[PDB]
Amino acid sequence: VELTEKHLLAFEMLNSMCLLENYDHVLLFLECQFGKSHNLAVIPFDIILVLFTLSTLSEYYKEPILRANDPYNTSRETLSRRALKLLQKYLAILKEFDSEQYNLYDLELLRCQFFLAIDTLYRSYISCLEQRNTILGNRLLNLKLNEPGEFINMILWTLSNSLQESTPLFLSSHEIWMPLLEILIDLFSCRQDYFIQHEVESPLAVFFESLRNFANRFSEYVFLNCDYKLPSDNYATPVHPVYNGENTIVDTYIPTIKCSPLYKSQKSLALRRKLIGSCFKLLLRVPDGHRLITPRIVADDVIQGISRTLASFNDILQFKKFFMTENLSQESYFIPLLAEGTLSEILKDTQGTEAILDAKEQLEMLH
C-alpha cells in the first residue's frame, strides 16, 4: 500500500528529525496529535524500528544517556516509557480496524507499516536506517535478533527473570522485555491472521517457533524458573543479557515500587500463558490430516507435556495464578484443555490439593 503526498512529507520530516538524533521531537510529533481529529499520523516502519530500539534503553541502567539526550525533560518522562506508550497506543489501534475511526486508508497504511517491521525480525525518501545502526548505544532490534540464535535467548532470558527476587534481573524483565515481548507476540498473532485468509508454514511457524527440536523441550522452555519437578538436569544454559549492562543497576536510579512475590508470579504466569496461547494459535489450525513439516510439532501430545509440568508442581500459589486468569474469554480453547489435562494426570498418578482448582475451572467455563 503506497503513501500519498500528505504522508510522504510526514515520513520525510520524521526521518530527518531522527537523523539529527532529535528523538524528543520525534515522540512529540506523534503524541501531540493522538486525541484530536481523525487524521492518524502513522509512523513509518523505519521509525517503528527506532521506537522498538528506544524502548530498550530503560532508565534503570542508562540514566546518563537519557538525561543527556534531552536535559529539560518537559514531559517528566523518559524516552523508553514514552516509546512504549506510543507502541501500545498504535497497537491497540491496529487491533481495532473500524471505519468509524480515523480512516479506512491510514489504518491500512499502519497495518502495512507494522507488518513491514516484524518481517525484518518505499523509494521516495532516504530513511534514517541506511546510515545509522545504533540508537544511543543500543544497536537495533532487527540486527540484534537476526544474529545466530539470538531470538531464542531473548525469550529464554525474560522468562527466567520474570520471577527473579533480585533487583536488576527482575527490573530488566519488568521494564524492557516483559512489555516488549507482549507487543511482539501481539503482532505475530495478527500477521499470522493476515497470512491464512490471504494465502490461496506461516509467520508464526517459521522464524518465531522454529528457533526448537522436540515437543518436550518447548514445555521445559515455557516454564523456565517455576518450582516444577525438574526431571531434566540438562536445563537451559545460563542466559546472557541481550544488551551490555542490562543486568546491572545504575547507582543514581532508585526504584520505588514494592512488588510482592504474588505480583511477580501473576505477571510471569500471564506472560507464560500468553506464550502458550500463541503456540496453540496455529497448532489448532492443522487439520486431521498430516502434521506440519517445519516446526515438527505433534499438536496432540504437547498438551500432555505442558499439563505434566503443571501437575508435577511444588507451589500452590503459582498453580492458582496460572488458571486464575483475568480474561476468561480472550484465552479460551486451551485453558479447559489444560484443565482436563492436568486433572487427568494427578488422578492417574495418585489415584494433592490441586484437583480442586481444575474442577473449579471446568465448572466456571459452563456459561
Binding site: 521531537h25 501531540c32 518537559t74 517528566r76 512489555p179 504474588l262 492458582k320 486464575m324
Partner: protein
Amino acid sequence: DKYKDWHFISKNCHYEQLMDLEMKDTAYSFLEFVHLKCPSITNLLVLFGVNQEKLKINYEKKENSRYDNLCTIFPVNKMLKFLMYFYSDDDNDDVREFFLKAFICLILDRKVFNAMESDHRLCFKVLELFNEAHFINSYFEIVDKNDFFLHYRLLQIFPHLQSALLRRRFSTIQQNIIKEFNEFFDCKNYKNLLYFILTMYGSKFIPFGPKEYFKDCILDISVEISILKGILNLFSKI
C-alpha cells in the same frame, strides 16, 4: 528544580498490611466481602501511606512543589483495584465527591504517574464512572494559573478531555486564550507559558499548521525560551 511534583503520597505504604489485603482477592476476583481491615476509604488511603489524615493542593502552602522523600509505592494497578471497591455508586454525594477527589489527587502525583502500566485500563475505567463535565467541573483542585503544568499531565493521562477542559478554564473563547497568552509574556512566567502552549495547541481554537501570532512575539522576546521556539516551529510544520 528536580522532582518538584505534587507528591500526594507522603509516607511509605504499609507493605505487609497491603500484601495481606492483596491475598484473598485473586480467587475472589475469579469467583467488598472483605472490608474488616480498612472500614472506610480514608483508612484505605492512609494504608497507601497517602496522607497524614487529609483533598486540595494548598499552593499558599507550596503543596504543588514538594521534594523526593524517597518513598515506596505499591503497584498502581493494585492501588486502583483496591480504591475501586469503595465506589458506592448508589450512595450520597458527599462521599462520592471524596472518592473522586481522592482518585484525582492520586493520579496526578509523580509517583503514580511515573510508575504506571503501559496499557491503561483502570485509569480509563475509573474516569468513565464520573461525568466528564463533572470530572472537569469538580476539577483537579489546582489554581487556574498553575492549571497548565498539571493540565499537561492530566492530558497525558487522558488526552480526550482537552476541548472539554479549556472551556471551563476560558469562559469566541479565543480572545481569552490570546489575552492569557499575555500576562504570561508580560511577566517572565515562561514555564507556565510553555505548558500553556503544550496544553492548548491542537484544539479547535489553536489548530496545527502554518496558518495565532505567538511566533512573532517569541521571536521578539529573545535557555527555556529556545524550547518554545522549537515547539512552535514543529507545530507550524504540521
